[PDB]
Amino acid sequence: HVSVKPAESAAGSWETYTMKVPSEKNLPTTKVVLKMPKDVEFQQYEPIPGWKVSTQKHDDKSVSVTWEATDGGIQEGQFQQFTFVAKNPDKAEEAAWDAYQYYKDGSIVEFTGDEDADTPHSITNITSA
Template identity: 55%
Template sequence: MKKTSWISKLTSTIATGTAAFMLFAGFASAHVTVSPSVAQTSAWQTYTIKIPSEKELPTTKITMKVPEGVAFKQYQPLAGWKITTEKNDSNEVTSITWEIDGDNEGILAGQFQQFNFVAQNPKAEAEIAWDAFQYYSDGSIVEWTGQPSDANPHSITTISEDPAAAGNAAAGGGHANDGHDSAGTEGATGDNAATDDSKANDDTTLGDALNDTVTGEPNNTDTDPGTLKLQQATLIVSILALILSFLGIALATRRKKR
């Protein structure tokens, strides 16, 4: 009887711990992010904001503030989402909002959504912060406005004059320059190549940025390997927790009968 009681307690403890781990796994790395994280000064840049769902409720609206010094130009329309902007007295866009439209249920649990827009970067080097506000169907709001060490950090993009840094951003989804990578064209070496690429970045146009825009689909859940692995791990842990819970209940029932 003591043995059964010990096993029951152990099983219950494991089940509780597993459930806690499952909850943690569901929230791990679930941050609103804006990419690229490094971009060229003065360039017309294609940006992508990625919104994951971190609750068991659908996300129905997202508002993003445009950082000071960034000139918002255009957004990419997306079926199922109504997109609006706010402007100041100088007719500059200060924020953009994506809100569900029609039959769209929003970003459901285990899903994420990406939105694309074009903006012109500041002329001087800087770190720009993208404050975002995520609205859920129950009216709750998650404010992604904290520092990198906070629980809800805002995403940061480093604006740099270094063509190599801008090239790294382009490789991660930044702007194109008519076939010229900011890190240097294939086969180009030395200071002359760096100088040519720097000039190419300065001459980046709105057309160049728009040519690099990725066509989005509502509630895209299958294109991020990291998200898929997280979902699979969460499912496995959830099943394990369920099995252990039933085992604990069975052992407890058996003990009572004795």
């Protein structure tokens, strides 16, 4: 389960988010893609050794951030944390973090489900502020 913390944050602020990516298969995780929630504006990322980071804007003006491994990736028994800054929406809402975790066999785990789903996305509760 890919979790973006803090799981609660104030509307209208810049927040320092940390995405934690645990290994869930005995296979290297080689890439992670995080869709920015609607109304969350990505600002900057923090460099991590062994990873190259890039942003991509799509037709619907949605933004995804990609961390790609350059030196083995996340191996069995490991997790890695990826920190970035984003501007929160200006109203209270549920910001859902759709994450895509790429393993070395070419498989992809889509953490995009709801509460009851097998691969759920994590959520930041954006509160009034």
